[PDB]
Design a protein around this motif. Structure first.
Motif, PDB file in Angstrom:
ATOM      1  N   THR A 187     -40.115 -36.948 -68.904  1.00 20.57           N
ATOM      2  CA  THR A 187     -39.378 -35.838 -69.023  1.00 20.57           C
ATOM      3  C   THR A 187     -39.975 -34.507 -68.383  1.00 20.57           C
ATOM      4  O   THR A 187     -41.317 -34.248 -68.614  1.00 20.57           O
ATOM      5  CB  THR A 187     -38.692 -35.533 -70.544  1.00 20.57           C
ATOM      6  N   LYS A 225     -35.457 -37.366 -66.759  1.00 21.37           N
ATOM      7  CA  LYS A 225     -34.472 -35.806 -67.001  1.00 21.37           C
ATOM      8  C   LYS A 225     -35.429 -34.763 -67.075  1.00 21.37           C
ATOM      9  O   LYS A 225     -36.491 -34.639 -67.235  1.00 21.37           O
ATOM     10  CB  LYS A 225     -33.805 -36.403 -68.495  1.00 21.37           C
ATOM     11  N   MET A 226     -34.383 -33.620 -66.952  1.00 23.74           N
ATOM     12  CA  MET A 226     -35.062 -32.499 -67.314  1.00 23.74           C
ATOM     13  C   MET A 226     -34.382 -31.652 -68.557  1.00 23.74           C
ATOM     14  O   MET A 226     -33.220 -31.753 -68.798  1.00 23.74           O
ATOM     15  CB  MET A 226     -34.857 -31.488 -65.963  1.00 23.74           C
ATOM     16  N   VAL A 227     -35.224 -30.783 -69.056  1.00 22.93           N
ATOM     17  CA  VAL A 227     -34.663 -30.161 -70.235  1.00 22.93           C
ATOM     18  C   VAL A 227     -35.162 -28.516 -70.109  1.00 22.93           C
ATOM     19  O   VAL A 227     -35.670 -27.999 -68.838  1.00 22.93           O
ATOM     20  CB  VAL A 227     -35.371 -30.510 -71.466  1.00 22.93           C
TER      21      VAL A 227
ATOM     22  N   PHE B 265     -29.968 -36.552 -75.435  1.00 25.99           N
ATOM     23  CA  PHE B 265     -29.589 -35.129 -75.611  1.00 25.99           C
ATOM     24  C   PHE B 265     -28.347 -35.475 -76.745  1.00 25.99           C
ATOM     25  O   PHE B 265     -28.342 -34.901 -77.605  1.00 25.99           O
ATOM     26  CB  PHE B 265     -28.750 -34.658 -74.260  1.00 25.99           C
ATOM     27  N   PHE B 270     -33.375 -33.554 -77.332  1.00 25.94           N
ATOM     28  CA  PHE B 270     -34.002 -32.688 -76.635  1.00 25.94           C
ATOM     29  C   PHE B 270     -32.877 -31.665 -76.332  1.00 25.94           C
ATOM     30  O   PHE B 270     -31.499 -31.925 -76.445  1.00 25.94           O
ATOM     31  CB  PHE B 270     -34.110 -33.367 -75.190  1.00 25.94           C
ATOM     32  N   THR B 271     -33.042 -30.439 -75.527  1.00 28.31           N
ATOM     33  CA  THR B 271     -32.280 -29.398 -75.289  1.00 28.31           C
ATOM     34  C   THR B 271     -31.853 -29.353 -73.948  1.00 28.31           C
ATOM     35  O   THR B 271     -32.684 -29.399 -72.812  1.00 28.31           O
ATOM     36  CB  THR B 271     -32.893 -28.010 -75.783  1.00 28.31           C
ATOM     37  N   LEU B 272     -30.623 -29.593 -73.633  1.00 35.72           N
ATOM     38  CA  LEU B 272     -29.887 -29.449 -72.016  1.00 35.72           C
ATOM     39  C   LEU B 272     -30.027 -28.218 -71.752  1.00 35.72           C
ATOM     40  O   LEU B 272     -29.854 -27.258 -72.285  1.00 35.72           O
ATOM     41  CB  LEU B 272     -28.564 -30.086 -72.120  1.00 35.72           C
ATOM     42  N   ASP B 273     -30.640 -28.181 -70.229  1.00 39.05           N
ATOM     43  CA  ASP B 273     -30.611 -26.669 -69.642  1.00 39.05           C
ATOM     44  C   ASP B 273     -29.430 -26.245 -69.454  1.00 39.05           C
ATOM     45  O   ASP B 273     -28.528 -26.786 -68.799  1.00 39.05           O
ATOM     46  CB  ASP B 273     -31.562 -26.992 -68.452  1.00 39.05           C
TER      47      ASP B 273
END
Lengths: 515, 515, 515
Positions: A187, A225-227, B265, B270-273
């Motif tokens: 991540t 994934k990206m956060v 998510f 985790f926090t979604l952008d």
């Protein structure tokens, strides 16, 4: 030329778009270990496809600290399209054999630094140090007085030289900095700050990113994934975002080859709750070399089930096994679980190089009359070292494990005895190696204890050569041992039968010697 | 008859082995919400299969606090095989329509407690309380003066009675304890202590387990994996192991229907952008009812896009939306992400019952002249209530949303004007509801503000009936509204046109008022 | 009159500022358990101080679900200034004895609901339910046929009434909603969303917040620190921010009284790695009543060291002890560590009420000829019940533990015998209790196994009264037992000596009977 960051956000591109930024003659460094561990697979696939379609880019140099792949068409095997790669330096060659094939055929320039030294030179490159001084490799094919780590005839330029400090010989290994990196993490946030929570281990991802960054290069990172910016725990971030130039998101990224879903035992997040054959025999005798409190390493081969045998004997918790890529401890329920720690790979090799291992267990392909061992080339094919030299150079006890003959040896253990059902048709104990991966003479000079364990005999290396110290019950000295070797070992005055318990299909009741 | 624990370890069985422990005439309670949320699918499949093969077990009673399934053949629809089920009490019937079909045809005994009251009665059953006293349901079909929550003519026994306390009317709902539970968690240790780290929510899993356990029943729990005793974080454990009788491990358990891999998510780790259609029009007008700092709830239907409209208008963070099953806040990127909290379902309903919601937005199937709303039966089909009664009983502002007519109603917005291109063939504003889901009279007695929003007209409920307060531009009062209703509304002297901004395909510039 | 939120941020005030929002005659609900657990100490202090300085606010009503304090001047004892409190309903009265003193002297109205029922009524009040129906309390002083839970002569109003459902007797307990809450958490974000990561347990904080909120009240929350909006894990949030009206930050907040820094073993984040006296004797005999796989509860008193005895005998992992305030399992290394789970308190009592406990161990003050037990009032002093009635009402096996006499009783275990050095001056086994906390008659009707264990004698309750079943070695039946009771027990025909091993200062080799 790198895509610009917009408002601090790391550029996110498809793998196809990302690899368009690799120029001709680039030096590419590829992160990863065997069987898909930490491999940026979509970037390798994209590069191979671009070359297949356009015949560009051309004449790349590859650096692969660890061997990627499945010993077949995966790993970096897809990059073995003629004209794509011209030069390669790898720590292990056998894992991607199509690249090995190019080297065997003198189609690329090809070098093998010891895997641990290789990763240390990349760390040196990050700091703009010209090279590293190490005595790892002295007396082997890596020594410039032998082959200088050159794998074929077309490879000419010297990367290694002999130096001297404090009245001792060392090798100086030149540090090569890459231009492009294919790295991976689990991540990252919008600015590139990356965590490794689902990955099997860390390897040398940070070192690779620093080396490329400080060489004015392009770091390309694959993630799952990206956060949101600054939402990851700072103590879990392994790569700072300013080291990353391009991110490729692969939502289906898996821990290993095979497309299995994420296993959280493998991630390290949760705690998980044997026939007497030739393999169990050798593993049992190998266990006799362990002491309480010992820190060990087991390589791939006949002895790699020693952990399971230790578990059966009830002493698995009495010692600790480490793996050169970073994991410490753990059990086999293609990755271990219930590990005790995961170190970065470069730090693990630092430990090995300074003689941290009390005992190591390594396979051998050939052994000669001087006690030298060959592993890096087998039947014409380039296998490479992996961590073999890093481990066998300075570990306190070196336990070579294998069979006495090769080529479909079949053995049966019956009535407390060894019975050779089908003899191997190739001798493994030969007069003289063509090339050396381990030097008997150097090991003796360093005061190391060297054992060779086979199914039918055990040897120890001494100043006058190999001493035969043990024979299996059911085996004849002359016909089954001496006639099957190409030199005469010294027969120990203390020659004894191998322990009776080894050949019985019940718990041995084996107690590890005290610390 | 339950399998014994060996050395404190919870028995682990296949779903096939587990369902064998269900006797004839057992009361089965099934955990889960729509679309696969917390559904123990392998147990439902195993039971349906046993019956399909052996016609055993027989004459089960089902309790289903929430609606499971996909509005088709999943959920508990597979249990609708003739003779398997004879009695059912569910909070939401429409989600598993094969069971609803049995009820419609007088083939099973069939009740509908409000979903919140239902979960509260299971909690009462855990404590051996005979039932609960609540004014939720007064004036609706749940009221004994109407249908007493009975869904068909064959259902006769009263479960609900009218009672009085402090000179006020209340309903007494009988508490019924289950004999068998099908529950689910992500993970449990070897003694059955269970965590919900990958689940979308918690629902009433603990309540169900306690109710069954204290009734001398069998609690069966499906999990994705099991871990070593006492290795889970004590503050993450939601179900203590001593409540669990059998565990079934399903390694491929997914968060929702459709087999997608775990989304972290969705786990909370985790926090979604938007086209200006009919649904967007109604959602926009519904947003006009929202106030700064409001706690709200949005039901499934025409206005369920209100969250996205608020995001477009830049006021999404000025209020908080809660969901009756437990989640608080969050965004739609099959479930919400970036939630603020997740409560257990029973606690969420406690909040709702005491008037915690400032505003709610609910769809209607029919509306009558008294302001009564019908939702639980439409066109002879049993839909059930879900949380509809729990929410519309005491919330401060009740916003009903729908269309004036239905059946191929075609509408288009042009030049800030409404144009009815094709009228619906059925009127939704009728003289008299056959069965009441919401009482206009009770809402007025409770001092609640009631609105009815359609694409072409807005109404408010007052003592003398529905007042028409707003008309869409492009619509004729007489032929598009009055002629399209089966009753005569009061026309407000303050009648105005619906805000023109609603019909323009651009940002409204809407600011949330603060009371 | 509440401070308004600015842009959604929860108002943050000093404790002094916060308590100014409490009006005369407010109903105040105070969160917390013994010894500082979850206590908003700065709020209690500020209120007591405001009153000391200004003689306002006046005539408060207090609701205290659990007992706060140190059995002296802490807890809510500071609120016992004349004119500050006029009315109180507490679950456990002895923990803050200054308030009990006011009750004893008829200076306040004073009720005692069973602690579990009390928390259930607060949960009812949150949902606007008028009261709860429960058979917990039937036949005790809580029964309106006895004292109706009224603790003194000036308390007149009936809050509890007898009702009938399904031909069974029940009590209806009126639900009372508070106007003000003093609650506490570890941490909250800027919007008031709160987590309990360092708190010993949860008690009923959410229930109290909901009850006050839905009554139009003011919820005041003390925390150790505040963090950025939406940065807490949603599955760790126990209280949604919209329930909190005022936050007070106390950076010096400690887990328990005494000012010790945070202990992360107490938080639950880490896993932590006996003289033969009168107390050990009783605990050893109490341990005989345990079974493998049993769920038990141990009350404060002579037997509360049973955990340590089980650990000495090596059977501690064979059963599980729960605590009525929420913690499940754990060890004593002021609070337990290595717990297995923490439930909210109301949920724990639901479990107890339904007969979830296989065994309980409770202290007694007095025992009468019918097997009745008195604990809530002794020697004119109001102690209250705590969870005594909740636990002793339906648990399958009820084990009362105490001494036969009291008043400087001196005993010694020497030579495998009990030696009464100095006899107690006061008899504890008397003819008739003035008030009843546990009914022998009701226990027998409910089919429960009731034991009375003392140092010298063991009894069992039967239809014809107490049967003496065991005598200590070294004790005379007539002079040391029969002469020291005010009634005549049936002497069991199977009368035996108490197990020899109990009186020997070595490990007993005790083995728990199977599940």
């Amino acid at each position: 030329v790198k895509p610009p960051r917009i408002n601090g956000r790391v550029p996110v591109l498809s793998a196809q778009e990302a690899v368009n930024y690799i120029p001709d003659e680039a030096t590419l460094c590829v992160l990863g270990a065997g069987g898909g561990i930490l491999e940026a697979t979509t970037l390798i696939t994209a590069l191979a496809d671009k070359y297949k379609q356009t015949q560009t880019p051309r004449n790349l140099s590859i650096i692969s600290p660890t061997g990627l792949g499945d010993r077949a068409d995966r790993g970096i095997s897809p990059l073995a399209q003629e004209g794509l790669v011209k030069w390669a330096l790898c720590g292990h060659w056998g894992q991607s054999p199509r690249i090995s094939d190019l080297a065997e055929q003198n189609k690329i320039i090809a070098y093998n630094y010891p895997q641990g030294v290789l990763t240390q030179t990349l760390r040196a490159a990050a700091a703009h140090q010209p090279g590293i001084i190490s005595d790892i490799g002295i007396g082997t094919f890596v020594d410039p007085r032998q082959q200088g780590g050159k794998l074929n005839e077309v490879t000419k330029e010297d990367l290694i030289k002999l130096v001297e400090f404090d009245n001792k010989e060392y090798l100086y290994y030149k540090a090569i900095a890459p231009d492009i990196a294919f790295i991976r993490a689990t991540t990252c946030d919008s600015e590139g700050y990356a965590t490794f929570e689902d990955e099997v281990m860390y390897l040398d991802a940070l070192v690779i990113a620093q080396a490329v960054h400080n060489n004015g290069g392009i770091v390309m990172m694959q993630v799952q994934k990206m956060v949101k910016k600054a939402t990851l725990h700072p103590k879990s971030v392994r790569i700072p975002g300013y080291l990353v130039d391009i991110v490729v998101v692969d939502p289906d990224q898996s821990q290993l080859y095979g497309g299995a879903p994420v296993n959280r035992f493998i991630s390290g997040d949760f705690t998980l709750d044997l026939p007497l054959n030739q393999r169990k025999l050798v593993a049992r005798r190998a266990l006799f070399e362990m002491r309480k409190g010992a820190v060990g390493n087991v390589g791939v081969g006949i002895a790699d089930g020693i952990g399971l045998v230790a578990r059966e004997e009830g002493c698995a918790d009495d010692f600790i096994l480490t793996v050169e890529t970073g994991p410490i401890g753990g059990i086999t329920s293609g990755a271990n679980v219930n590990t005790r720690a995961i170190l970065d790979m470069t730090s693990q090799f630092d430990f090995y190089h300074g003689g941290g291992l009390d005992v190591c267990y390594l396979s051998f392909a050939e052994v000669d009359q001087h006690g030298n061992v060959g592993v890096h080339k087998f039947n014409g094919k380039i296998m490479g070292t992996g961590g073999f030299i890093d481990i066998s150079a300075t570990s306190k006890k070196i336990i070579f494990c294998g069979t006495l003959t090769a080529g479909s040896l079949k053995t049966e253990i019956a009535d407390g005895k060894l019975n050779i059902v089908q003899e191997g048709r190739v001798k493994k104990f030969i007069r003289e190696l063509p090339e050396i991966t381990f030097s008997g003479k150097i090991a003796l000079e360093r005061g190391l204890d060297v054992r060779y364990i086979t199914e039918r005999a055990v040897f120890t290396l001494k100043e006058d050569g190999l001493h035969l110290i043990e024979i299996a019950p059911g085996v004849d000295l002359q016909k089954d041992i001496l006639d099957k070797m190409d030199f005469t070992p010294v027969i120990s005055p203390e020659l004894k039968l191998m322990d009776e318990r080894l050949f019985i299909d019940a718990a041995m009741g084996f107690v590890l010697p005290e610390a």
